[PDB]
Amino acid sequence: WTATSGSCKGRCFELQEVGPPDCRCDNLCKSYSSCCHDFDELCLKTARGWECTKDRCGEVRNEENACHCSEDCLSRGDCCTNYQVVCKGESHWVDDDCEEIKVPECPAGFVRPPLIIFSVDGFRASYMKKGSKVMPNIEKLRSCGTHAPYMRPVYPTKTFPNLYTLATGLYPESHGIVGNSMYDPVFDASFHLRGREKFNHRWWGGQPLWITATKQGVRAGTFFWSVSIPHERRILTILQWLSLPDNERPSVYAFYSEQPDFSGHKYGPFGPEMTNPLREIDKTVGQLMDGLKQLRLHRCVNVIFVGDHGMEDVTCDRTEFLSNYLTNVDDITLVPGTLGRIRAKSINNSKYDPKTIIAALTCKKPDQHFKPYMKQHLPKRLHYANNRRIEDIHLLVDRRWHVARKPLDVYKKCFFQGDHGFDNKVNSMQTVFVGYGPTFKYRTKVPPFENIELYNVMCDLLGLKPAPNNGTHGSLNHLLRTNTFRPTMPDEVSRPNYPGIMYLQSEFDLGCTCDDKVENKLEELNKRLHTKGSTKERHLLYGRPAVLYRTSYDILYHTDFESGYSEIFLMPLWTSYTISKQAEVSSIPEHLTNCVRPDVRVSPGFSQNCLAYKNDKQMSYGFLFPPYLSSSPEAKYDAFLVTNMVPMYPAFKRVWAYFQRVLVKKYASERNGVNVISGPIFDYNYDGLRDTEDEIKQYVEGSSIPVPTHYYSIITSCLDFTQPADKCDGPLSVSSFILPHRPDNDESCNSSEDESKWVEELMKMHTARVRDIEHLTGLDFYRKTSRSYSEILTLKTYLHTYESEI
Template structure:
């Protein structure tokens, strides 16, 4: 039996016990049946768990399919149905029924949810007009509006398009309350990782539930949906909402303890039928109707008890559903891999570890094997940073990121029984799920921007008056969905302001650099910085949204140029960030650009000990340098000179320069043309331990040794005005942003087309490594957008937005 049926059985009990102070969680799995011999008479919801082979009557027996055969009869009382019918109206009370239609049921608080509508002529909740609930209308004794969260497994966002004909109650929640066009799950888009993310606000790598199945090398134990090990608390990290509530004075409990203020109920539908039928089958309409009917029972029950203006309700999915079939399966046995030497967790993503625990390497590494293959193999530290799927020992070292609709397996199993699946890259459209919020605390008839599921924990804490535990969400980013958000986010204080560069006592020195047209120190001084020059730097042009703030202790200075500005780190001898604005080009014949000269010059504003040396680059056979501000964009002789300064360079592998040059020389110009100009902020990232956070300066130097530190990634943040009639620097309204976190690797094997022209593969690679601005900020220790026309909640919403580059169809 599913949690849908349990909710169906007890919607009235659910609503009746809302005045209390404990927290209730209900979860569901697909564990194996054990035994049904014995009886639950006198044993309902016993606290002691009966051991196999005996049958069980505790609140988890449904989870393990091990209830006694009469559990439903005695404990769930299913004999009398869950709704009133015309012939039940005015019935004689029967205590064996789950709910009642007798004349005394209202006084006793145990009517079936449709009693007043069917037996007393009231209207159903779904038939009432939308009404704006101006404030909680709760019975005496309520401290705060309770919260009910119903998660529906595998509810793809496109199912909402079925509308009133199939899901009228959900459609009313969407229309009358607050909704998002979709909610993005975390990766992997599987049930257990996502349910626990909803409960904690943490990524799977942070809370530890990295899959429905996993191996812990320290515990030397396996976790699965069908095993008892999943009940061991050692697997579950972070602080779920019910523990947060308990720690802050709200009693915690389980399903059978009364008086909760928050209910979390999970239905395994429509996921089961989505797997069996695929997401586009018309036969899915029936399970969707059943789910909607349960939601209707809930809302009717709340209305019947006059709680429909008191309780906050969230309906949310854990992930979407994609078409999949065993005919679209890659078999590792067809690759040059000894499948007998590996353990593979197969399916919509592949996780590989060596079968021999003493082995520290695996033959399958991040290299293309076949041009037509339908997966990308990665070492986990090379996975797109937006996935946040590396920093946990339970995540295997080798990961196969599957193409949508495709599976991975060791060998052909010779059988097939599915037409849908999930677990794929969480940015693809088919993995999107739903968010609906309704009640006195939610905005009326409001559509908010799409968001990721890590953000809901903070919202639930706000609804319950709790202080959130540390989590991966950005508190306040969803304030626009609440009428009176209790938390007001504030801009973080800058830790390290920049120092100004001083050229008054600068002298020239030899860094082993050579360029044509070298100039004297005096001319250099004039070219680099002349405050009286007509080209004095305009911060409004190159820093239109404010200077990035540095949120860690360091030493850096501002280096001003006619076409770009840099925050230059003395400790790293390279910029922390470089910002410049690329205008839309005037439509007119342009002269042929001069060839870019690959050379660099010393920068007299930076002391010798804080500068990279050209000799370092020339002596490193594996390394080279690249420019943060692209010389290709320089239109004046002064700008060309600025672009060639060594303070505009960063260490860069020759292979990566193919990606970087195409981005700078081709794509930035196109983006500027399409968006009426763009602002670009770019720089290096150091995350050698792949924990998703900026490495400390000490750690960076440890990893670098005696060599110059080499970034693990480069970031690019591109912003334009949402109103394309306004330029980026003059924008006085909403902003658009997309960002890239590009892995800095010594090869381009991630792309099977890397031997082709860059136009055939680079942009696809960039889109795969799309990221949120918040991801960039956490990896750099910077804070961006400190001077905009947006309020701070809108700024946080912008920072947490992910441009997926996926079609909405």
């Protein structure tokens, strides 16, 4: 119930929200069907439009007008945004030359530069270049301020997940808004675009910017706008709030535009109908900047122009139907479109089996345009699994396509020509970032970055302490003139042991054999030097990784590689080695095919054993430092140490062996040497975080050897590739991956072919940030470089995407 008989007189767009049954006058009252009877008359005035004209200048104030051109309007804070241009001979902001804002130039009473977020739905990154001719205001913000060529959204590349990620710094799996449509099985409740459930606070997790600000005593404008409020009125409302007395005035504001997304869905991303929406958004930017200029705030406010995601060409004819795959199509519920999420239609049906559903959906048609995954098998870079609202079965849909349950869903629900939601590395899904103001840099281009990083920066811009989030605070310091956040490196928690030779060969009963008993002070002293770390500077280029949790581990040195060996997990946490451009690949000699060698520095009790692999009929083993890349025949024997062995399914060994034999050398050729750090990852509860020993669900049969869920590699070289990786004077270049350790290659439909036709494709799909590996391992990399810590944080957030030019 709402008693709509109260009044909005003097309460229009009030900031404090009033609770039922008292009638509301705030910018969301329309969405709640709760506005006071006179809200339209008083608060949504439209008389005489949005622009001053010559004849209105110095008019007698008429309170019915949408905005004013009378002499008193400046002091009332309610002139039309072009008032000073029409009536007082001023220029439009867009017409003024760009001049560096070296310091904030703020009116008295302003405690800090205000922040205005200008968010645009479906604004695809390439619109900045492709639409530049029809967006002069936006082009001026972009060229004069700080801009990225694009900003990466979160998966899924849907509206609410991305807007709320912008507001929180969190991945969707953590904030809880995991799609535009959701079912929560604990609440037994459904979230939809239409209706009232979506307003219940239980859906919205984390701590959004407006709450962070309020808790720390920084006032916020309301971020949300009911669709029926015209954009011109939203801008006038923001400008009016900015004229409030100091103690009442918010410091942070958001404007939201439904365009260009609305038209993009109808016309496709580059339909000729798209020019007009782009013009109109630019005009709105112009209105804001003109109004800021009137308030003398155009060189005081920080403005962020940011989109939520892009837009791809998608039409009804490019739809895959599950009814062409599944016999049991009425036993499932599908969330459809540019991603698929499948669950059982009834929880009372015990003939439901996810394994048979996945199998019926796997490589069934030659050009199949989606791929099924159990959620824990999705690329870890999507961070899309750790929430009960994410269904166990997920369909990753190719760009330009939809998935639907049955054909009748698509015609009895072509209308649309655009959609979004696809994998967040897809070029068409990329969106925009521009920052303009005293706190941002002048005429500066920054590399692409992820939208999870912005919350921390917005907190920095407002002097706020961010709530715990998924940005890496300091990684975006290069966007900022001042207010940088200067983080310290985390302290190492566990210090390593440095074991010498402590065990005789006969103490080991591992069931391993090696033809190594074939045999000199010239060469013997030298081998001893290698075991004490004499080649370490070559192979450990950026310091040893720090272990940020409590554990027991040993540093092991060798001619060709160094490792951090876990006595708890019985294998390395990391293995580090450098491969120069000149390095040569060799084979595993015939006599060494099955060679495994006890490591006399490490006790039998903290070693793996070969018998466990002999007896586990599903599990084989691989090596972290590859024997193929040994520096000499004699050095090769180190690669067969039991302390360099890791458990691998035969199907995974196909992938790993090709990476090690073919790709590492290829990367060293192309990049002028590479440094590689490889290791295992254990994430059995798919939370993106390192498992403790008691979370491990699978062991090599009969043994305490844990089976990794994933294997990573971090591949570093010199950004200036005229310098070799091991003698780099400046910035670094990195690419990394987190490969799923799976017992089949069902993910790769072409896997019966030679590895040259499918392995690198798999690896590209599983590209990762160094930071993603940090979370999954509790390790901290790049501890000893010549680079600034902020630069290193940016390097750690880098993702190599393998997409072509934007």
